[PDB]
Amino acid sequence: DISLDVLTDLVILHPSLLLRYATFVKTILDSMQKLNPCQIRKLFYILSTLAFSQRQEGSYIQDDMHMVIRKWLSSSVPNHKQMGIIGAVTMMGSVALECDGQLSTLLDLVGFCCEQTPEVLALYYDELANLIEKQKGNLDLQLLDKFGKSLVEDFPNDFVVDLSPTVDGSFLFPVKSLYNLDEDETQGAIAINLLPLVSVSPICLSPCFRLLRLYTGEQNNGSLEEIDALLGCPLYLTDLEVEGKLDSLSKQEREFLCSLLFYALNWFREVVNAFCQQQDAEMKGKVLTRLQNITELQNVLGKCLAATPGYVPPPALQSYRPYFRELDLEVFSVLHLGPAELCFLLDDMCWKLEHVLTFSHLCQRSPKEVAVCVVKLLKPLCNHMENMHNYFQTVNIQEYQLMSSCYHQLLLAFRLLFAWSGFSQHENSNLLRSALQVLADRLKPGETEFLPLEELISESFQYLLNFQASIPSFQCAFILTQVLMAISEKPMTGWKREKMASLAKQFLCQSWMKPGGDREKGSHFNSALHTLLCVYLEHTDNILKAIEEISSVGVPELINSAKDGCSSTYPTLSRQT
Amino acid sequence: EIPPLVYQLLLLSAKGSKKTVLEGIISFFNQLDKRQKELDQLRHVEGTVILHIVSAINLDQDIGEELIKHLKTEQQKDPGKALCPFSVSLLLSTAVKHRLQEQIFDFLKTSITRSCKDLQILQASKFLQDLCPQQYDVTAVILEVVKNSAFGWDHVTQGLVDLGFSLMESYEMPAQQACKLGASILLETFKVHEPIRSDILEQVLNRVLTKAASPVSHFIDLLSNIVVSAPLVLQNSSSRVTETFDNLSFLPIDTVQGLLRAVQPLLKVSMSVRDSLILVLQKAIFSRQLDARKAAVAGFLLLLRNFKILGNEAFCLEILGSLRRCLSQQADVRLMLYEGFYDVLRRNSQLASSIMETLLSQIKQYYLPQQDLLPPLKLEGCIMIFLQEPLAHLLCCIQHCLAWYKSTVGFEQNFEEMLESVTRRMIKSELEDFELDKSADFSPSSGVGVKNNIYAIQVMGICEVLIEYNFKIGNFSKNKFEDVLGLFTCYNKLSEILKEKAGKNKSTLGNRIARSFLSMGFVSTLLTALFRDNAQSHEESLAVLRSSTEFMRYAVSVALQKVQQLEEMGQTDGPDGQNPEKMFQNLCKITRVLLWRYTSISISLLCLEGLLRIFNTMQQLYAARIPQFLQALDINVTEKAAFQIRQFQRSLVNQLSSAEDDFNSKETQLLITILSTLSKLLDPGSQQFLQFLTWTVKICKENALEDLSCCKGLLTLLFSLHVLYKSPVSLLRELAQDIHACLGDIDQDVEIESRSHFAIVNVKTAAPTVCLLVLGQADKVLEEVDWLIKRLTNQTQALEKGVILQLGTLLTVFHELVQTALPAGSCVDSLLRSLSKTYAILTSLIKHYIQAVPGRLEKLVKLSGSHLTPQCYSFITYVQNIHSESLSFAEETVMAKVLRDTKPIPNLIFAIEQYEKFLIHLSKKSKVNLMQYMKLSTSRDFRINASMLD
DNA sequence: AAAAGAACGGAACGCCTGCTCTGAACCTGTGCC
Structure with a gap:
């Protein structure tokens, strides 16, 4: 792939210089039956149009390609036969x-x-x-x-x-x-x-x-x-x-x-x-x-x-x-209301977010375009988010589970958005600031007006922390605290580390159960709690003191009192867990 | 017929599958070649098909990628097989395609290195040959490939030359074997591939001057071989004779001499090369520096003999004075012309007169003629700090040139008069006459001291030369002998007391004295006159010479240094020193008097060294010339060799049986080493091989070599014979009983009988004296076991049966030692080092069999658990008591000692459980409970004694 | 049920020390000097 990518620049700079050996290059490419479809497109892109571009003497390669496709468009080898029409598309x-x-x-x-x-x-x-x-x-x-x-x-x-x-x-x-x-x-x-x-x-x-x-x-x-x-x-x-x-x-x-x-x-x-x-x-x-x-x-x-x-x-x-x-x-274009429709739409976008930010149409754009696409209509996203928040303040199982899943999927969206390792590269720090500006203006009355980076960090931190009060499922708490890590700096400051400790300990002390009872103990639950415990213990003040308190109050109450249930001070902790 | 059919088959494989059709056509070619070996049309068909297949593979390189994996898998399975001429030819042909040739070359290099290592292992141990007869030699097939592809092939020659070019650099032991193989294949392809001769010569010339810093001795060797094979190849490779002198005078390590000797026919048939080298000579000799001017003068001296002396003579008359113009040079630079002038003096008559005249002028520059006065030698001339005029080498050159000039047939009258006068002056003088009168005159690191030190080094060097000259003049002449004997009295007068300066280092440089100055012919003849020179023709001059006891000691001591010079370096000082065939005759004559003098019955201790070094030289230098020496020793090689051992066994047993008062342990150690050095070349299946073993085990089990090295030396000998013939685990088991009987057991509550099976070991020999050597064999025994186990990873049933026998017997051995109280030295350490090693080898055989139950393996494990593990852990508890008692000797920062004294202990545990963890793995996969015999892995805790701290 | 997956489990060549064998004239003791 890198060889073809650099060949693009080489032929762009000096088409004659490349086509000097282009005869052997095209002969090898045609002879090599092994070629990935993306590599097929990359090669054929110039292999089929060099003659049309370099009209002086490129007709030999075009004639060879046309002869080989004519012998292979009706050829008995459908595997890679569509490479010919792919080269045709490249020519147009x-x-x-x-x-x-x-x-x-x-x-x-x-x-x-x-x-x-x-x-x-x-x-x-x-x-x-x-x-x-x-x-x-x-x-x-x-x-x-x-x-x-x-x-x-x-x-x-x-x-x-x-x-x-x-x-x-x-x-x-x-x-x-x-x-x-x-x-x-x-x-x-x-x-x-x-x-x-x-x-x-x-x-x-x-x-x-x-x-x-x-x-x-x-x-x-x-x-x-x-x-x-x-x-x-x-x-x-x-x-x-x-x-x-x-x-x-x-x-x-x-x-x-x-x-x-x-x-x-x-x-x-x-x-x-x-x-x-x-x-x-x-x-x-x-x-x-x-x-x-x-x-x-x-x-x-x-x-x-x-x-x-x-x-x-x-x-x-x-x-x-x-x-x-x-x-x-x-x-x-009409993103800004069927809750099932919302669940399905953001389920369609969640897989793409998980793949591009971690099948030809989504791969056609770089993550730089992914950022602009996602920030195009962040306003309806926050609008629906506060709608669901208001509903949960108001709080049918068949609808409650729907809102819970939509909540979880939206937090999945923001976490896999802002935990992107591409933000380590500063090539588009201005784009990151512009993307965070809408959130900062949503928290405050508005008018960020080239807000300071630290001010934006604190504002987004508090705005996303607003959701920390009402949470339907523990998986949502996981993804909330992880997106809260994602927006903030990698190494938290003292104030943010204290906030992390407080929120994570509160979630540990929270009790989680499905709408029909049936405590949410599962499999993804296990990894979620693993990450919660890791981040909490990492961001605690007295790490030894915290682990001592846990192992000295939570475990003994579970072994003494609990029979098939959780611990009193830590309802998240379970015998199975 | 066949070529088009196989071309169609290859096209089908391109359309179909290639996993098996390739191997099938290799096999077809293989049996065709086998049946045709006992075919030029068939060879042309083979060339056509290989051309077709290589063109097809070059068109589609990725198709041939599976060949690499297929051949690697076959090599992993087949021990050296599948490397047929067809396969290697296909591999080299696609290498010329330039696609992925580096990885193929690396795989080839790994294969040949493994092959030569395996060949060395099999040669150095027959015990592996009996159980692993699959001795596959890559060298044989690759050398046969030269003849196989010598019938006008498309790219076989190019593949072979690329292979050799990679091989020569890969060579840089296994390296020597690789270099020899590469040189042989290059010579073969030069003698075979006619149309690539010029290209090969040009390429090697480009490479020959390609490693200035790195050694290129193999390069010059191969170039000399190809040039002597094809003298006119470089003539057709013209415009390179002038070019080859680009940077020739940079790194002479004998490379320049070899290059000149290899190209000498070209110079003598190429006038342009001679003119160009003459032009370079002016720049070389006039180089003001001395870093590389030695190479120039050495090359010119060699050239003087390179050109014939038939009789244009104007060429010589011109070139005579060139080197003499640089006579006023550094002493180190001035050294080499004195040594090298004799070689060219035997090639001309007028040149001899001129050289003699120049040397006469040079010696007269220092002679200082007079009568009845101070020593003529103006030693102060070369005093200044350093020296710039060596004298001993000059005088030796003088006497050699004089002898040759006299033999071939006034400067010669001046020479003899000057030689006679200085000899007469020397005897009519003393240390008082010289500048060095008092013993406390010169000291090291002193300006006056080093000056006197240089003077002392010069003068006794002079005395040696005059000794040689008078011997030739004094044919049974007592007066000359009287001068000779008196001259030596001056030589040792400087020595003994003020030898060199004093030299408080208890070292013996040059056997006993500094580098001698005696021609090998003379010292050979002097001893024959000195020993075995009994006749009425002599005028008692030998007898009075025999009266000088120190003359006896010095008589052979010089030759002992001389043979040591030939022992390490391949050449030696003196005329004809670098000529091996001339030296070989000298080697034949000298040995007789050295051996006879010892048998006459200190001085004889010198002859023991002289013999022990003369065998070690010819066995390592004159490999092809051994029969000539054996004929002169007086193809029954083993008969006479065993005969000499018999003459030596009598002396040893007589000395060993004698009382300790007359022991002379230095001779006894030599008496043993000579046995080992003479036991290297016995008949592999000879009866004397068994007979010698039967005698030595009797002596070892009966006698008691209480001396340290005598016991160690004799025990080293018996194993060298008892490796290529059998396994010694029975002996090691037997020895382990004696040391167990020697001391008390670890349990401290059990006693043992005497059980003195071997008298070599006793109570005083409980030290690492023995329990380090046997563990060394235990290291070697397991070292070779890993090799076959790695190969083990139809006859495999015999392969497993043999290993479990040796390992099982060895397991009993370790059990015997591990119950004893081993000495607290490094033998405790080394026992734990091999104990960690032993468990690891227990794994890879089991780790292999995982991918495959027998009760024989279980019985080994049952014995392993019963006799090794609980004793080992109890032995660990023993070490705690030993170290605590031993650590009390702390002069009455012990952090360093404590850690080392217990370093192997943790890794002993780990090697126990890593075997155990996989043995757990085997038990479940093997559906057998193997843990009933064994015991739970014990462990230890500690406790700090708080009360003891008070 | 005891199957995958890939994140978990794991391996090879390179390094100069803190090592012990070797070294060295000595200085002591005692029959000889």
Whole structure:
């Protein structure tokens, strides 16, 4: 990877100097069958466009690459065969900073080699989506049209369903317009015939709505003009309550309905991707309704997913997470209220936070962009946070557990945000100060006005300490005290160390139990308490005095009085723990 | 037919799998070569297929990455196997591809180092050969590879030359073996690979001048070998004869001499090289400094003999005065010309006259002629602090040149008159005549003292030279002998009392005296006249010479220094010293009188040293010339060698049986060492080998060598024979009984009978005198055990049976010592050092078998628990009493002593439990309860006596 | 149930000391000097 990365700079500085040995380099790259897909993109990025860039004498490499792909686009080795279309995407991206002839020839070869390949239009459209998403900004309108205007021939011909209620056929279940269009009689034809599309590739349709979003992002500012009658489409599927007869399925329709649902929620993710940022007549409202719909649909799915013993769904709970539309944070234009929807949204963002700050779309941006993305709408985050705080001040188990989990997941978010080891590097200390400025202004009346670093530290410390009073679960206490470490300095000062000792001892003296009794003693609980004890004993004043007091008052009371419960002075301590 | 088929198979492997097809085609080539050994078309087919496969591997380097892992796994499994000519050829071919060749070269270096180490281990111990006959030699296959790939191969020559270039630097014992292997393969490929001869010569010339600071002796050796093999190779490598003198005069360690000797034919057939070296000579000789001017004069002196003396003579007439122009130089620099002028004097006649005239002028510069007056030698000339005119070497050169000039056939009349006068002047003089009159005249670190010290060093050096000259002149002439004997009286007059200066160091530099000045031929002839020179032709001059007892002592003492010079260094002073074949004849003649004089029945103690050093020289220098010496000793090598031992056994037993009043332990120690040094080359399977063993164990078990080194020396001998023939654990067990009988047991409540199985050990020998040597064998015995265990990690059943026998018997041994009261010296320490070692070896065999139950292993463990562990821990309790009693001797900061005196104790425990922890691991995995025999690991506490502190 | 994972468990070559064997004229004792 480092060799290719430096080769980028070497070819940028002196393209002729690199292409001097570029013949041998490209011969070795093509000969080497072992190449990671990222390395495939990196090599092909210049391997396919050197001739178009260096038009003087680069035609040999382009001819070799075109010949090898023509011999391998229809070749019997699908493993790495998509590397050819990947290089095609690289070529258009380079042209997307005449050349249309080579792109047209490559597209014609790909279409000839993928006349009946199922995973041909799928991966080709995925590549185009990645193109415009990542480096398609400078692409000419004519070039983008010639590359991807086949939507007008594909989508309305056999993938744009009809809104007539006359849907009938040899389907496993009848067609019911679940989540019907909000605007009844305004546009009847706006519907998608999912069952006719499955029983015209159901796998291929899911990575398409992204592509029309990408087309309308360049041919216009928003997607309203193209999908005005299609943004509110319902889904042609069986009755939602039909999933209740999971036993009645018996694979007679269970697999087919499972595939139905699996394409359905991914389609919901696709539409929330394509028609979110723009503001139009009820666009954001309809986005919120779609969010509620996908939450309810996933909740309904859970039942049959448990009922279905095994599955191999096509990627185009948490176990099915890989086979899902990994929707990025660009959909968050309406972040500023379904608590389940909040739990699901921040669950989507939590995994990305845990990975990038510790699968192509989230990896496409550096953590510098992650910081700006997360700070774009920190205001609704704190607003919902204080809403949950107010609810807990007010304090149904089915809702209480939901708020508790959302609380825990939000603290997970801030802790994995501010415990980032990248803050050790001072390359963006100004960005850190700007990010902390909103929190500092939230604590105080506002108007930080280039607040001092120590002042910001103290303000954020106290503001996040405000939450230390009411806590639903011990895991939340763990993550609260750890994010409180994360914002503050690595080595705490005396005042902060005293505060740490006090809060940690209070949490140790707190009693924790699930809403239905059932003390929260588990497995993650063990590691959480381990970290709590470590940080508390480290940040105590008299470490020997503290351990002596613990081992001399807490343990004896447990061994003498407790039979199957905790200790009186330390309810966190348990016989199992 | 086969080449295209295997090319298609390789393409299939590229499409399919390569784990087994590669090895299959190696095996096919292997049996093809085996059946064709007892084939030029087949060899051409082999070249074609290796070319195809190497091109394919170069195209896809990562395909061949699995070869490294496959061969490493095979080498781990096969002990030296799978390194066939095909495999190594494939390895070297891809090395030329330049991809990952460093790691392949490192693996090859590790393999060959392991191979030569294993070869040395097997050679130095037959006990491993019997149980490990799988002696695989990488050297044999790699040297056969030269002939195998000598049929016009694509890249075999390049691979071999790269391999040798890596090998020579890897050599830098195992290093010597690696250097020898690299030199041999380079010589073989030079004699075989014709079209790479010029490239090889250019590359080695570039490398030859590549290590100025580091030694390059192997480089010059290989260059000389290739040049003598192909004299005209460097002629075709022209424009380098001039170039080779870039920095030749920087680091002469004999490298310059070797380079000159190797390239000498080129100079004598290349006039341009001669002219260029002549041009460099002016710069070299005129260098005002003396740091490196020695190399220049040495090279010029060698060149003087390099050019023939047939008879342009104008060349010599010009070059005569070049070195004489630098005669007025430093004394150390002036030294070498005196030693080297004799060699060139035997190559010309007019040059001899000129050199004699120049030396006559030089000696007349110091002669100071007169009659009946002060000593002629103006010793004060070279006094100043340092010296700049050595005299003994000059006089020796004078006499040697005079002898050669007389033999070949007025300066010569002046020479003899000057020599005669100075000899007459010396006897007609005394210390009073010289500047050194009184004993309390000169002292070390004194300006007058060091001046007199230098004068004393010069004058007795002069006396030696005049002794040599008069002997040649005085052919059975009593008057010359009278001068000779009287001259020596002056020599030792300086010595004995004021020897050198005094030298209070109880050391004997140069056997007994400083570096002598006598030609090896003369001292060889002097002793023959001095001993065995009985005849009526002599005029009693030998008899009066024999009357001088100190002359007897000095007569051989010089030769003893001379042989020691040849013992350490490969050359020696005096004419023909560096000629081995000339020296070998001298070595043959000298030994007879030295041995006979001892058998005549102090002075004889000198001859014991003289013999003991003469064997140690030829066995280590004249390896190929031993049969000539054995013929001159008077292929029955063992017969006569054993005969000499018989003549020596009689003397030892007579001396050993005699009373302690007439003991002379110095001779007895020599009597034992000569046995050991003469027991190195007996017949490996000879009956005398067994016969000598039968005698010595009888003497050792019967006699009592109460002397320290006599017991140690004899015990060292018996093991050197009892290593390559059998295992000594029975003897060590037997000896352990005697020391146990010698003292009281640790339990302090049990007695033992006399059980004096060996009389060598007794009560007074309970010291580390014996219990350190046997533990050294215990170290060696376990040291070689690890080697096979590592290899052990069809016949493996025999492999395990033998180890458990030696270890089991040795386990009983340690039990015997561990119950005794060992002496509190380092023997206590060393016993705990090997006891820690022993437990570790117990592990790796068990640790190996984990990856594989036998009751034989259990019985060893049962014996290990019963006879070793509780005694060892009780022995630890014994050490507490011993150290406490021993620590009382603290002159009536003991922190240092206390820590050391108990350092092995903690690590003894740890080595017990690390074996135990894995033995726990084995028991569960082995489904057998092994802990019933053993005992819980005991431990100790302490307590501070508060009352005792008052 | 007693399976993984990776964080927990663990290994190799390099270093000059504080070491003990070796060293040294001595100075003592006593039959000889």
